From TrEMBL, chain A:
Family designation: Belongs to the sigma-70 factor family. RpoD/SigA subfamily.
Residues of the full protein shown: 563 to 612 of 613
Organism of derivation: Escherichia coli
Complexes and interactors: Interacts transiently with the RNA polymerase catalytic core.
Signal peptide per UniProt: none
Cellular compartment(s): Cytoplasm
Annotation: DNA-binding region: 11-30
Protein name stated in the entry: RNA polymerase sigma factor RpoD
Stretches the record annotates as Sigma-70 factor domain-4: 1-38
RNA polymerase sigma-70 domain span: 10-36
Record function comment: Sigma factors are initiation factors that promote the attachment of RNA polymerase to specific initiation sites and are then released. This sigma factor is the primary sigma factor during exponential growth.
Amino acid sequence: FGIDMNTDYTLEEVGKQFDVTRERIRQIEAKALRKLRHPSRSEVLRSFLD
Amino acid sequence: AANKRSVMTLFSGPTDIYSHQVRIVLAEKGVSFEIEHVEKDNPPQDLIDLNPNQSVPTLVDRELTLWESRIIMEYLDERFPHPPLMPVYPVARGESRLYMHRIEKDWYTLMNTIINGSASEADAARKQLREELLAIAPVFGQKPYFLSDEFSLVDCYLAPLLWRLPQLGIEFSGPGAKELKGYMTRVFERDSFLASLTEAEREMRL
Amino acid sequence: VMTLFSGPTDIYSHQVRIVLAEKGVSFEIEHVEKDNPPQDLIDLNPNQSVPTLVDRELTLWESRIIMEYLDERFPHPPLMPVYPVARGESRLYMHRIEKDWYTLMNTIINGSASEADAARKQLREELLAIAPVFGQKPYFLSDEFSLVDCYLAPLLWRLPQLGIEFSGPGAKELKGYMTRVFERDSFLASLTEAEREMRLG
Amino acid sequence: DPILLRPVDDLELTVRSANCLKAEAIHYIGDLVQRTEVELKSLTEIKDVLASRGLSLGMRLENWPPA
C-alpha cells in the first residue's frame, strides 16, 4: 500500500526488491495480513469502523 | 563472475568518500551488499577488467558496472524504493539535485586542495571552508535536516564530508556553533550511518 | 514566464533547446553575447554559466539538472526508460559522451592546431565504431528518439565546422542516422540562425 | 487471570501444534490449564508457549465456562 511512502506498487514489481521473485510475495503479505486480522492486534484498529 | 549472482557487486574505497557516500544510501535501504576495501595500487581483478573507466566506487548488478556516485546512489533510490530518500515534486526534486551539484563543485575542491595544496591554501581553504560552513548555520533551526525535514540524499552528501572534519585539520569556532554542532548530534549516529561507517575512517574521531 | 539564458552556438544550449521544443514547452529565450550573457544574470545565477533556466520561482544550471527536470515534469512524450534497469543505462551512456567526446572537442576549438589533429582522428575511429550498431535500431540504442540521442543531434551538427567527416566506411550506417533525426520538427524548430550556417542543411 | 479467556489461536502458537490442538475439538484456553497430557514435535510447543506468558499444565479451575 502507500503507507508512509510514495505511490503504491505491484507484487512482482516489489519482488524485484526482495530479490526472491515468485508468487511468494502474494503469500508473505497474505498470511501476515491474516495475523493483523486476528483479535487484540486489531483491537485498536477496529475502533475506526462504524 | 561479478554479475553471476542475484546480488550486487561493489568495489569500494576504504578511505575515498565516493564509496562512503554510497555506503549510507546503500545500507539505508536494507540491502545485503558486498564490501571490498580495495586500493588503486591493488584493487580486485574484476574491478579492473569489467570497469572500462576504472573509478572507485563501482557497483555491479547482473547487467553492468555503475560508477560516478550520483549515478550509483540514484540507481538504488530509483529501484529499491522503501524507505524513500528523494521527494516527489519535480520542483523540490530539481533543487534537491541542485544542492548536491553545489557541494561536489563547491565543497569538494576544498577537500582536494587541502589534500594537495600549499601551507597557506590549507588555511585559505580552511578559511573559506570553516567560516562559510558557519554561514549556513541558521538553516538548521527551521529544519531538522538540510531544508528537508525527512532524511534525504542531500543530507548524505554532507555527513561524509562532515565526518572528515578534523581529518584534514579543521575545527569550528564562533557564535552559534551549538546549532550546527548540536545538529551533528542528530545525524552522526544513525543506523544508516552507524552500521555504514568504516572503522578506518572512525579513528580520526578521538 | 519560462525563460532560458541560451547560448547562441554552444552545444549545451542547443541541448536544452531540443528538449524544450520537443515537449512543447512555451518558452522565451534570452541570448548571450558570445558565450557570455549579461553581468545582470549573476543575481539569479552565482555561477554565471549558461544555460540557466528561470520558471517563475526556480533557478537551475548544469543542464544535466535542467533536462531531467523538463522530462520529469512535462511527462509526454517521454524521453527515458520506464523501469529502473534501463534508466541506469541511459543515465550512464550519457555520462560517457559528456566525459570522453565533449571535452575531447575542447582542444579542437580551444586547443592549438597541434592537438587539434590529436583529437580529430583519434575521435573519428570511435565515430564509426558504433556506426554498424545503427543496424539494430533507428536511434542510438532505441526504437524511438530519447534523451540519449539529445547529446548526439547537437553533436553531429558541429561536424563540418570542426573539420571531421565521413568517407566510405563510417558513413553508410551512420549518415542514415542524421538524415532520420535532423528532420524532426523538434530539431527543426530548434535550429538557430547562428548554428544553421555551419552546414548546408 | 485475564489470560484464561482468550481465543485458543490468540497465543500465536505454531500451526501444526496449533492444528493438532484445534483440530482435536478444543474450545477455550481456560480448559487448557485444565487439559491433561494423557488427553493429547508437538509436545515441545505447548510447553514453552504456556511457560512464556504465565500459563501451565494440569491446573485446577472450577466454575468454567459460563460464557
